[PDB]
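User: My instructor asked us to take a sequence, write out its structure as tokens, and then describe one feature of it. I'm not sure where to start. Here is the sequence I was given:
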Amino acid sequence: GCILNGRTDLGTLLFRCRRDSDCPGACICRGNGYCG
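Assistant: Let's start with the prediction itself. The structure tokens for your sequence are:
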């Protein structure tokens, strides 16, 4: 889905996005509880 130096949909980042930092590409840590 995304890709630009980061943890695009990973194990821990799988949810509760610890921070938008885990979302390099379009993906981003939103209230949804993940780098959506």
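For the description part of your assignment, you could build on this observation: Residues 28 and 35 are 4 Å apart (CA to CA). Try explaining in your own words what that tells you about the chain.
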